[PDB]
Design a protein around this ligand. Sequence first.
Ligand code: MG
Length: 126
Amino acid sequence: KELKFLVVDDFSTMRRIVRNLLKELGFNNVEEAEDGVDALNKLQAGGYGFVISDWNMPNMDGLELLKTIRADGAMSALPVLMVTAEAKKENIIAAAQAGASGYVVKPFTAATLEEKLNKIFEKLGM
Ligand SMILES: [Mg+2]
């Protein structure tokens, strides 16, 4: 599957981990973004096929980034995997209403990530 991923997380250590987990699953075309604003700049360049986004981030959080993607004429169907942390239980109902493609709690292993990605590829038909 030739898919270009965008990994968005305000902690540089976590972006690196997720990127290396994707590399182990065979995905080598992975770009990183620091928050929702940075993510908008990368997405506008085009070519992205999947977004993995942390929920809590400064400047623009994962929910506002999701809602922006979903309102965009060309990118409204872009899959978005929402990432939450044990620290805070998020407003899942709002992400579900905005069309999140799925949810996963970090930290996660490549095995868990693979199972989440396979489930989304199947449910959406990618
Ligand atoms: Mg964060």
